[PDB]
Structure formats: C-alpha cells, structure tokens
Amino acid sequence: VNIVDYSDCFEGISGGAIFCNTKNKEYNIYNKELIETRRSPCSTFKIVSTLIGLEKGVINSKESVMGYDGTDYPNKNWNKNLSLEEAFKESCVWYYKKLINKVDAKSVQNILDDLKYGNCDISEWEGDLKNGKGHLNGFWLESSLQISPKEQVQTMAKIFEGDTNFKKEHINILRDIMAIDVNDANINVYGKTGTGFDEKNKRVDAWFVGMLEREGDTYYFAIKSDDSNKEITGPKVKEIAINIIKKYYS
Ligand SMILES: *C(=O)N1C[C@H](NOS(=O)(=O)O)CC[C@H]1C(N)=O
C-alpha cells in the first residue's frame, strides 16, 4: 500500500483515486479517507446489473433488446429498441430499470452478498422517490446501496480475474462494452462513469471505475470526486482518470 499524490491531475477538484495490481499486490491510494468511504454507485452499477441480467437470462448478448414501448424521452437515443451495447453506452435508464425489475430480490441480494458489493442494501428497491422522478429511480441511484471506491476495485478484480461464478462468456460481453478509446494503442482501458448528487451532504458522487491492461500487468481502479460543485460529473472524473493513467501508468 503506497500513498500517492495525484492532486495535479485533479485540477483543483476534490476527490481520490485507488489503483490495484493484483499480481504484485501493489495498492496505490490517493486520499485514503475518501477511498474507504461508501457512497451510492450510481450508473457504475451497470457493470454488475448487466452481469445479473445475463446470468438470469433476461438478456443474452450485446445485441439483446428489452422491448421498447414507445415512451417519449429527452435523450433521442433512448427512444428506440436499443441493444445492450447501446443501452450501456447511452446509459438508458428505462432499459436497465426494466431489466432489473425482471429479477427477484432474493437473487439480487445473494449476488451482491457473493460479490461483497458494499453494504449490499437493496431495501429501497424503488430508489429515491422523493426526487419526483418516479420509475426512473432505483436502489443503486442515490438510494440505499452504497459502496466504497476500494470495494469497487475489489469487486472489479474478482469479476475480471475469473474469481466469481459468472460465466466467462458473460464477463467477455462486459469487457467488450466497457472498452474505451484513450488515443493510446499501447494501453487497453475499460470503465464506466456514474453521476449523482448527494442531497443530504450537498456533494456530487462522480465516478469512473474500471481497469487497465498494459503489457502483461493489469490494474483495477476507481476514481471518485465528492466536490461541492454540481458541475463535477462522471465524464469529468473520467477525464481526470485518463490524465492519471497517461501520466503514471503508461
Ligand atoms: C448514472 O449515473 N446515471 C445515468 C446517466 N448517465 O450517467 S453517466 O453520464 O455518469 O454515465 C445520467 C446520470 C445518472 C442518473 N441521473 O441516473
């Protein structure tokens, strides 16, 4: 466990980062207190909910559809019978809500327990209804489920090193749709952003979680902001993560 200083890449935004290489058990931590604090995963939960849907047969491949019903949404890409790959990349809430609501709560509880997914608290299945957004909510969106950045990395490592019971074919579908382009062919980066606002504490929950493969070694990472500036989003923290990767992990 090496404490590191990545502040220069955070451009004055408050947050922290953790990178773990499981071959040599090298844990690099910036802002240890934040890295151990549990927070709502927001859209980073799509990493796990995709695997749940695959395991239960609700979806089967990166082409799988969830039967769009014609409901009007402001994001033009949500207004179609989109595939799993497009729903993941466009963060289509209705698709992932419909997916999870086809799965019984016991099954979800047991999968989260097996993954040690933070507090594994799905008690508020419907999510944070007081925000007025009705069915666009759920337990993983600023609600009962909370996970620390360190626990995110531990979960990613267990999934993608083959240490869970999820099928290898399903893990590879996730890998496929998580891959991003960082304009550097010499590193493979995979990840997912998440964005929420913590109304109790008036701070953002802005995430980028994933992995990086660079010539033999693999690092699992979580970058997290808790800034009070509402302009700080998941996509903003992904930019910060990319800067760290290129500066320190290239
Ligand atoms: C997940 O965090 N969400 C879904 C959607 N996309 O998030 S992302 O841009 O961070 O990937 C919008 C934000 C958030 C939500 N409001 O549900």
* Alpha carbon nearest to ligand 1 atom 6, residue: 91
Lookup result for tokens 């969106």: 141
Q: Are 125 and 106 in contact (CB under 8 A)?
A: no
Residue 41: both structure tokens together: 């995963």
Which distant-in-sequence residues (6+ apart) come within 8 Å of 200 by Cβ? Answer: none
CATH number of the domain bearing residue 140:
3.40.710.10
Whether 174 and 155 have beta carbons less than 8 Å apart is answered as no
Side chain identity, residue 70: G
Q: Domain range holding 133? A: 2-248
- Give the distance (Å) from ligand 1 centre to CA of residue 209: 13
The dihedral over CA atoms of 245, 247, 249, 250, expressed in degrees to the nearest 10, equals: 110
* Residues 227, 190 contacting (CB under 8 angstroms): no
Distances (CA, A) of 104 to 92, 187, 196, 237: 21, 39, 25, 33
Counts of helices then strands in the chain (DSSP H, E): 8, 7
Distance in angstroms (rounded) separating the CA atoms of residues 14 and 107: 36
Buried b (16+ CB within 10 A) or exposed e, 212-229: bebeeebbbbbbbbbbee
Q: What is the DSSP letter of 138?
A: -
Question: Quick one: resolution in A?
Answer: 1.8
3 state SS of 211: strand
* Ligand 1 centroid from CA 193, angstroms: 7
C-alpha to C-alpha distance for 125 and 109, rounded to whole angstroms: 11
Tell me how many domains the chain contains. 1
Residues in contact with ligand 1 by the CB-under-6-Å rule are 42-43, 91, 93, 141, 193-196, 234-235
Exposure b/e, 171-209, CB count within 10 A at least 16 = b: bebbeebbeeebeeeeeebbbbbbbbbeeeeebbbbbbb
